[PDB]
Design an enzyme around this catalytic site. Sequence first.
Site, PDB file in Angstrom:
ATOM      1  N   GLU A   1     -86.882  11.354  66.756  1.00 56.98           N
ATOM      2  CA  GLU A   1     -87.948  10.914  65.878  1.00 56.98           C
ATOM      3  C   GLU A   1     -87.285  10.378  64.605  1.00 56.98           C
ATOM      4  O   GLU A   1     -86.870  11.138  63.732  1.00 56.98           O
ATOM      5  CB  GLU A   1     -88.906  12.075  65.591  1.00 56.98           C
ATOM      6  CG  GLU A   1     -89.773  12.502  66.775  1.00 56.98           C
ATOM      7  CD  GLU A   1     -90.961  11.585  67.060  1.00 56.98           C
ATOM      8  OE1 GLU A   1     -91.089  10.515  66.427  1.00 56.98           O
ATOM      9  OE2 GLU A   1     -91.775  11.927  67.943  1.00 56.98           O
TER      10      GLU A   1
ATOM     11  N   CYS B   1     -91.852   8.870  56.969  1.00 55.11           N
ATOM     12  CA  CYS B   1     -91.284   8.083  58.069  1.00 55.11           C
ATOM     13  C   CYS B   1     -92.034   6.795  58.442  1.00 55.11           C
ATOM     14  O   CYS B   1     -91.418   5.746  58.667  1.00 55.11           O
ATOM     15  CB  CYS B   1     -91.131   8.981  59.308  1.00 55.11           C
ATOM     16  SG  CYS B   1     -92.494  10.120  59.682  1.00 55.11           S
TER      17      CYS B   1
ATOM     18  N   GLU C   1     -84.887   0.673  55.297  1.00 59.30           N
ATOM     19  CA  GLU C   1     -85.780   1.767  54.932  1.00 59.30           C
ATOM     20  C   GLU C   1     -85.436   2.285  53.533  1.00 59.30           C
ATOM     21  O   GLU C   1     -84.474   3.031  53.356  1.00 59.30           O
ATOM     22  CB  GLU C   1     -85.724   2.904  55.968  1.00 59.30           C
ATOM     23  CG  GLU C   1     -86.814   3.954  55.784  1.00 59.30           C
ATOM     24  CD  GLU C   1     -86.779   5.075  56.815  1.00 59.30           C
ATOM     25  OE1 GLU C   1     -85.693   5.665  57.034  1.00 59.30           O
ATOM     26  OE2 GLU C   1     -87.852   5.387  57.385  1.00 59.30           O
TER      27      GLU C   1
ATOM     28  N   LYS D   1     -82.229  24.048  63.000  1.00 56.59           N
ATOM     29  CA  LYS D   1     -81.476  23.737  61.778  1.00 56.59           C
ATOM     30  C   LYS D   1     -82.353  22.949  60.794  1.00 56.59           C
ATOM     31  O   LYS D   1     -82.658  21.788  61.025  1.00 56.59           O
ATOM     32  CB  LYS D   1     -80.212  22.949  62.121  1.00 56.59           C
ATOM     33  CG  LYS D   1     -78.996  23.273  61.255  1.00 56.59           C
ATOM     34  CD  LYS D   1     -79.106  22.810  59.807  1.00 56.59           C
ATOM     35  CE  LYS D   1     -79.068  21.294  59.659  1.00 56.59           C
ATOM     36  NZ  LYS D   1     -79.194  20.896  58.230  1.00 56.59           N
TER      37      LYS D   1
HETATM   38  N1  LIG Z   1     -90.401  10.148  62.977  1.00 57.83           N
HETATM   39  C1  LIG Z   1     -90.529  11.329  62.385  1.00 57.83           C
HETATM   40  O1  LIG Z   1     -91.174  12.244  62.896  1.00 57.83           O
HETATM   41  C2  LIG Z   1     -89.872  11.494  61.048  1.00 57.83           C
HETATM   42  C3  LIG Z   1     -90.439  12.393  60.167  1.00 57.83           C
HETATM   43  C4  LIG Z   1     -89.860  12.548  58.927  1.00 57.83           C
HETATM   44  C5  LIG Z   1     -88.726  11.812  58.566  1.00 57.83           C
HETATM   45  N2  LIG Z   1     -88.171  10.933  59.422  1.00 57.83           N
HETATM   46  C6  LIG Z   1     -86.964  10.157  59.019  1.00 57.83           C
HETATM   47  O2  LIG Z   1     -85.915  10.999  58.517  1.00 57.83           O
HETATM   48  C7  LIG Z   1     -85.155  10.368  57.474  1.00 57.83           C
HETATM   49  C8  LIG Z   1     -85.173  11.211  56.208  1.00 57.83           C
HETATM   50  O3  LIG Z   1     -84.462  12.443  56.358  1.00 57.83           O
HETATM   51  P1  LIG Z   1     -82.877  12.488  56.115  1.00 57.83           P
HETATM   52  O4  LIG Z   1     -82.373  11.384  55.250  1.00 57.83           O
HETATM   53  O5  LIG Z   1     -82.399  13.881  55.505  1.00 57.83           O
HETATM   54  O6  LIG Z   1     -82.181  12.280  57.534  1.00 57.83           O
HETATM   55  P2  LIG Z   1     -80.822  12.876  58.064  1.00 57.83           P
HETATM   56  O7  LIG Z   1     -80.488  12.114  59.326  1.00 57.83           O
HETATM   57  O8  LIG Z   1     -79.818  12.612  56.970  1.00 57.83           O
HETATM   58  O9  LIG Z   1     -80.836  14.460  58.268  1.00 57.83           O
HETATM   59  C9  LIG Z   1     -81.908  15.062  58.974  1.00 57.83           C
HETATM   60  C10 LIG Z   1     -81.461  16.406  59.522  1.00 57.83           C
HETATM   61  O10 LIG Z   1     -80.354  16.202  60.392  1.00 57.83           O
HETATM   62  C11 LIG Z   1     -79.181  16.827  59.867  1.00 57.83           C
HETATM   63  N3  LIG Z   1     -77.955  16.002  60.111  1.00 57.83           N
HETATM   64  C12 LIG Z   1     -77.389  15.070  59.309  1.00 57.83           C
HETATM   65  N4  LIG Z   1     -76.272  14.555  59.881  1.00 57.83           N
HETATM   66  C13 LIG Z   1     -76.093  15.148  61.078  1.00 57.83           C
HETATM   67  C14 LIG Z   1     -75.169  15.054  62.111  1.00 57.83           C
HETATM   68  N5  LIG Z   1     -74.135  14.195  62.030  1.00 57.83           N
HETATM   69  N6  LIG Z   1     -75.323  15.837  63.211  1.00 57.83           N
HETATM   70  C15 LIG Z   1     -76.353  16.699  63.335  1.00 57.83           C
HETATM   71  N7  LIG Z   1     -77.291  16.839  62.370  1.00 57.83           N
HETATM   72  C16 LIG Z   1     -77.212  16.102  61.223  1.00 57.83           C
HETATM   73  C17 LIG Z   1     -79.495  17.152  58.404  1.00 57.83           C
HETATM   74  O11 LIG Z   1     -78.793  18.306  57.953  1.00 57.83           O
HETATM   75  C18 LIG Z   1     -80.994  17.366  58.442  1.00 57.83           C
HETATM   76  O12 LIG Z   1     -81.346  18.703  58.849  1.00 57.83           O
HETATM   77  C19 LIG Z   1     -85.816   9.027  57.234  1.00 57.83           C
HETATM   78  O13 LIG Z   1     -85.004   8.007  57.814  1.00 57.83           O
HETATM   79  C20 LIG Z   1     -87.198   9.190  57.867  1.00 57.83           C
HETATM   80  O14 LIG Z   1     -87.793   7.947  58.254  1.00 57.83           O
HETATM   81  C21 LIG Z   1     -88.726  10.775  60.655  1.00 57.83           C
END
Ligand SMILES: NC(=O)c1ccc[n+]([C@@H]2O[C@H](COP(=O)([O-])OP(=O)(O)OC[C@H]3O[C@@H](n4cnc5c(N)ncnc54)[C@H](O)[C@@H]3O)[C@@H](O)[C@H]2O)c1
Lengths: 493, 493
Positions: free
Chosen positions: A261, A295, A392, A185
């Site tokens: 992650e 991240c 963050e 997804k």
């Molecule tokens: N450690 C890593 O490898 C890494 C890499 C990139 C980003 N990040 C982190 O990701 C975040 C940025 O992305 P974001 O704001 O879109 O995060 P997010 O948690 O809002 O969403 C990420 C993904 O999960 C899905 N999602 C959202 N809610 C969900 C739920 N309740 N159940 C299942 N799936 C769900 C979204 O559709 C999307 O595909 C930041 O906090 C960043 O630090 C981590």
Amino acid sequence: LPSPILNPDIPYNQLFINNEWQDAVSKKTFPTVNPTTGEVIGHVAEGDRADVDRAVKAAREAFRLGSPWRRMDASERGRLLNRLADLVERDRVYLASLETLDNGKPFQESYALDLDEVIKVYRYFAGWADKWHGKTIPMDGQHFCFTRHEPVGVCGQIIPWNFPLVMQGWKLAPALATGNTVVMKVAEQTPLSALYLASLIKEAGFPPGVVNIITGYGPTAGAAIAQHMDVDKVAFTGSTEVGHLIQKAAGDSNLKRVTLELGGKSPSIVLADADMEHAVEQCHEALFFNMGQCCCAGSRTFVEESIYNEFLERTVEKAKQRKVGNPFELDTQQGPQVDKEQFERVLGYIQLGQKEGAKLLCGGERFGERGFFIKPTVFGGVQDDMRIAKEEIFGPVQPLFKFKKIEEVVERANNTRYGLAAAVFTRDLDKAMYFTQALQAGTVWVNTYNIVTCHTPFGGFKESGNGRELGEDGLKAYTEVKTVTIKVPQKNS
Amino acid sequence: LPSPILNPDIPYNQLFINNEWQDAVSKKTFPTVNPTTGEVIGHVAEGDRADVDRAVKAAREAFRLGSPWRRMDASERGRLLNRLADLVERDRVYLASLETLDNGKPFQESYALDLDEVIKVYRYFAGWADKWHGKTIPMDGQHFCFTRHEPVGVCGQIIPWNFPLVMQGWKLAPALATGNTVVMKVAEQTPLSALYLASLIKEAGFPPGVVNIITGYGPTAGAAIAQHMDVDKVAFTGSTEVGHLIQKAAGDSNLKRVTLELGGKSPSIVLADADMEHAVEQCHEALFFNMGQCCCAGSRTFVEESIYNEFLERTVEKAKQRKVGNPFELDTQQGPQVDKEQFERVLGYIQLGQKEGAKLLCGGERFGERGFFIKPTVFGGVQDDMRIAKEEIFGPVQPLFKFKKIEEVVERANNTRYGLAAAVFTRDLDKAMYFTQALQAGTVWVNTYNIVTCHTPFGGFKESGNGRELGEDGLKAYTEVKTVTIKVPQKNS
Ligand SMILES: NC(=O)c1ccc[n+]([C@@H]2O[C@H](COP(=O)([O-])OP(=O)(O)OC[C@H]3O[C@@H](n4cnc5c(N)ncnc54)[C@H](O)[C@@H]3O)[C@@H](O)[C@H]2O)c1
Ligand SMILES: NC(=O)c1ccc[n+]([C@@H]2O[C@H](COP(=O)([O-])OP(=O)(O)OC[C@H]3O[C@@H](n4cnc5c(N)ncnc54)[C@H](O)[C@@H]3O)[C@@H](O)[C@H]2O)c1
Ligand code: NA
Ligand code: NA
């Protein structure tokens, strides 16, 4: 330094299931925006639970004992990952353009950094496919004992928007190399790049159902995967808050295996004896790289007391210098934030810093009129109790901290739920070796920042994650160990 | 085989926290029952939430940077674990007796098997302490990259009642070898032996706070650990049922790392060409071992049509032969079930089996009228859809099944939410080889059963577990990987 395709044909805008393009059960779609112009690029299929069910059955079938994908040589799985990488390099200019279109990042980034890391992860793990070994074990008794490294199975995979193709590779490459099948997804922002790549997975010769891609929302499509009773493993890249939900859905459904992650509030630590101009440049790039939407971004710069004023002045000048503009024009360093929410969300954090007592040194407002651009912002006099210091921000905002002692700054660096990354700038051997032990982070850099490649394990301590991605260590998540213990007539060393 | 101590003194009946024996904060206690007679042996301290906080505070302090535990040599951690093996072997008779007294297992088992597996497991992981290697990585760019294998931190450890000393040793030995601290919750049914051991942890010279023991109830003391916000890892061995709650509790708290070692319904599969006498004897012991109170017990004996009648008759005879009685008698093979609740739960399953149309072939009722003894029971003509075919009985009840083809028995064996273990009995090479690929189990035996040593990784597929215990693979759970990436002046091969 090639020439970007300024507005291209986007043939792919539907679900990829069982190696064929098809709409959602409901026939719904949703808009994706171009963050530079602010205008809708086009509509993409909106996935939900029924669509997931389809993908999982496709995936489950491709993983049947006896399947083309299961019978196949581990070296053939590698060659497919290698072909796939040949194809990514062939369509590099299209992909790097389509990434910049949908995400907003600079085309110099997309092409040079992002797409290069996409090619190398598929190529790196290709090589790992036939090299992942189990053990023979000289156990007690009249026994021949060995371990098999089997795939875990149907792997659900959920990724964010900030590096759409990279994050996809980090997931697919190792899962496929270890022989798994995948229901992925992608983000609701940035869905287009990942669908074009899915086309190349078909062209490469991957069997039907080995990879399935789903565009859609998190609370629906995502949570369908994390809760499915026939998904063996979930791998989630995203926010710490959603991480908590994913691990609960595993425990609530079928006890599927979980890697997380998550977020960071990663410290950049500059000692007295550091190379001044090198620290200022790296700590600047640490934060503002990918417009702060990374991240492990260096979102808390701690600087030794004796060099603080000098470090401050140079850091601000580097931010004022930072070229903000249209990402397709090469030489642009900072594009727009990815959508409307993130734009407003960051702007709120800028306001909040001011309200708490921090000095706004530069920027601190919208750049221009169109799109979601923000002027590079730096704060000073920042304290640990402040909300900008704890949360963050995920945008171009650099908070600067002062410290006196070595024992002081380690306590303050670690004092957080996060633990993804950290860094030291110092010329001293002993101090470098102390910080690598002392700092509670999954990746520690010494005199550099944001150096992560296909060889380097990557993940968080504490609430930044569970498990690791990339390197040899990243295969363990996609491995289920079978112990095989056979009675034998007589046993000899 | 030595004499047992029939009336041992039991000095230890309190919490073990920071190398101090203490009463719970509430001063509450609770009784532990000798299951051979039914009488209360004595009372132990009833730990709850406030007592776990106190244990976790001590374990945290022991884990601090610069503590004795952290800056000690890895080889000294090994020598401590070895010294403790010596102390266990010194007090082997005492401990095997106290185990029998509290658990009800035969004193032959307790001494020769259980206490031997305890010594071997502490001696084994003593060896691993200073041999647990990270990596140096030939990474892209001008970098020196290596990994540290750090302890994961404060490890919450929860174990069941069936192999008290062994289950504790599977937990403490690798955890300590890798430099973690421990808060352990032992089963309420069998709290005594685990406390006398903590006496030897102190005597061996482990620092204060490194190992802490809490006696108390699951929903109170265990939930306090699993939900605790300063515990870094939980390792839970128990029912699949409680497993779902532990993984949920982690997602609901601080995203602690989770290994689950859960229930089973493991199939033993006998083919036509097997050595009958041997296959009979092994499948018999597969189920009846430790009074049927064994996670990976052969609790579904499948038998090929052509040898079924002969198999059944011999199995039934064996069941009727098995000396039930007082566990302190040297020739006793089957003791009582662990308590009244477990005793009655099994008689419920015996009743339930016959209500579903299973044929009772022997036993099937209480044995005598004192303690918690049940007669070796065996069930003929059992079908896949019956509750006694599907659910974990955890008692001396051996259901027999019948099959014609291999592809049939593989389907039927695998058709369960469990997958801890399995076995096949055969003379043929290709067949043995096929079953080792086909069976969905974390352990697969060939012409043997219940062979689990310190060397051999052990854990479940599907809802039988998350992750692996014992062997080298057993160390991964207790390890948090840190990647260090250092900028170097130049990089050469
Ligand atoms: N450690 C890593 O490898 C890494 C890499 C990139 C980003 N990040 C982190 O990701 C975040 C940025 O992305 P974001 O704001 O879109 O995060 P997010 O948690 O809002 O969403 C990420 C993904 O999960 C899905 N999602 C959202 N809610 C969900 C739920 N309740 N159940 C299942 N799936 C769900 C979204 O559709 C999307 O595909 C930041 O906090 C960043 O630090 C981590
Ligand atoms: N796979 C293995 O390594 C292994 C080995 C031996 C036994 N087992 C399994 O253990 C089970 C038998 O032990 P059990 O009857 O005591 O099971 P159990 O689930 O009731 O409890 C196990 C332990 O967890 C505690 N507990 C109970 N409820 C809890 C809760 N809500 N929160 C936290 N802790 C809680 C108990 O006090 C006990 O110490 C069987 O399912 C058996 O197959 C597994
Ligand atoms: Na978008
Ligand atoms: Na007892």
